[PDB]
Design a protein around this ligand. Structure first.
Ligand SMILES: OC[C@H]1NC[C@@H](O)[C@@H](O)[C@@H]1O
Ligand SMILES: [Ca+2]
Length: 456
């Protein structure tokens, strides 16, 4: 129960929260996908030690080597992909493949690469479709892929590129990169976009966008825009088509989904359905200011910076207007002049908070790019809310049902893997005053906070 002396107090705090969280996992869900902190149990989604894998690079970065070594032992002896189980190509890629690739790079342990290549190969069946656009699911054990319980979601097939490309680079096996790039290239020419904005679904057989006319930057589309830029940065900034699509998409966001609340004029991104704008914004969308700032660092328009700063402020407010200080799953904004009206509105069904990272993720980028200490302060405040309302005494942290009630937040008895894989990682990195720690010049984070090296 002692941490390194060099660490500033905020990073130590993050480490203290991690240990408490890791504690519950070690005692009640060791080797299992997700922890059930409240009931001191666990749940299985893939049965591949999701949380352990998703937290490998986080432990390494926080200097929790003893913990890392123990988790490394489990991967070495308990992780088996020879299982008859269906997995989502996207969720598997960003957490498992990305998680292993990061672990391999930070630790240098070839074990993680071996597992990654193994897993990468078991995921390939998913691309066996008429259009080459991948099926949503794939049984890693039997080798057969298939659509969900129809179509595939656009974000899902366009948010697996960084991982597959890197695996090809490290293994020399080009099939991973090729499959994944074919998808990106096909999406590039595909019509049905509204000034860069892509629809939520795409048919694996016809390879065409479906559910036309409905656009959103939240679930089902979000990371698509994120990976346009990140792939660009990953490839040494030479794949200009990615860049072009990205800047077009941003302008498209400005022109069709960007609005301002009343009476405070909070900048926010809403959803568009067949011409009808909806002042609705998923917390998921809070990744945008982060990606926006990232691009600015890499030479994108200064107008992108203002947008980033504005949206960072809004996402911050999305958390702070809540009684617990934690943002709800979805936030509606008031759009028309009404005196005593609040800017932020939240429907009862959306008052949940699953310890998502999007806000702290973007604060990290905003600070790295602006150097403005207030973003660190904001992150510190959010960590406090997590500690005060989501902490489980016996160990771990839990998602909650009521983000608006500090006396009865209502734990849902579940700790998402992205909490240790992302939320605490970004917070640790946010509180760092060393620009050389996973520099924006050398590394690029996949959509699950797993850092991958920028190529030369
Ligand atoms: O809130 C985060 C959750 N969904 C979006 C993904 O890109 C990843 O960040 C995590 O799976
Ligand atoms: Ca993400």
């Amino acid at each position: 129960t002692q941490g390194p002396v060099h660490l500033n107090y905020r990073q130590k705090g993050v480490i203290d929260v991690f240990l408490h969280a890791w504690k519950g996992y070690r005692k009640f869900a060791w080797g299992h996908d997700e922890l059930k902190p409240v009931s001191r149990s666990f749940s299985e989604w893939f049965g591949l030690g999701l949380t352990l894998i998703d937290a490998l690079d986080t432990m390494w970065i926080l200097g929790l080597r003893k913990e890392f070594e123990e988790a490394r032992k489990w991967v070495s002896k308990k992780l088996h992909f020879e299982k008859d189980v269906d997995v989502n190509l996207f969720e598997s890629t960003i957490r498992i493949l990305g998680g292993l690739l990061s672990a391999y790079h930070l630790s240098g342990d070839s074990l993680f690469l071996r597992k990654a290549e193994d897993f990468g190969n078991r995921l390939m069946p998913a691309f066996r479709t008429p259009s080459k656009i991948p099926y949503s699911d794939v049984n890693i054990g039997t080798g057969v892929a298939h659509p969900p319980r129809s179509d595939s979601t656009v974000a899902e097939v366009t948010s697996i590129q960084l991982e597959f490309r890197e695996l090809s680079r490290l293994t020399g096996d080009k099939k991973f990169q090729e499959a994944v790039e074919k998808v990106t290239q096909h999406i590039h020419g595909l019509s049905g976009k509204k000034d860069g904005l892509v629809p939520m679904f795409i048919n694996t057989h016809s390879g065409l966008f479906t559910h036309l006319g409905v656009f959103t930057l939240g679930a089902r589309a979000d990371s698509y825009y994120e990976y346009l830029l990140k792939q660009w940065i990953q490839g040494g900034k030479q794949e200009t088509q990615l860049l072009e699509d990205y800047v077009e998409a941003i302008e498209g966001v400005r022109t069709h989904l960007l609005r301002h609340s009343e009476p405070s004029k909070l900048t926010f991104v809403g959803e568009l359905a067949h011409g009808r704008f909806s002042a609705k914004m998923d917390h998921l969308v809070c990744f945008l200011p982060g990606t926006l700032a990232l691009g600015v660092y890499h030479g994108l328009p200064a107008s992108h910076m203002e947008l980033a700063q504005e949206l960072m402020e809004t996402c911050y407010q999305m958390n702070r207007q809540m009684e617990t200080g934690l943002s709800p799953e979805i936030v509606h904004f008031n759009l028309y002049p009404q005196p005593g009206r609040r800017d932020v509105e939240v429907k009862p069904a959306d008052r949940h908070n699953l310890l998502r990272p999007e806000t702290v993720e973007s604060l990290f980028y905003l600070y790295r790019v602006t150097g403005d200490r207030k973003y660190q302060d904001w992150g510190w405040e959010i960590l406090q809310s997590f500690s005060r309302f989501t902490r489980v005494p016996s160990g771990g942290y839990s998602s909650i049902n009521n983000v608006q009630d500090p006396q009865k937040p209502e734990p849902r008895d579940k700790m998402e893997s992205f909490f240790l894989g992302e939320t605490l990682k970004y917070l640790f990195l946010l509180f760092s005053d060393d620009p050389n720690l996973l520099s924006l010049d050398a590394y690029v984070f996949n959509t699950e906070a797993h850092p991958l090296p920028i190529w030369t």
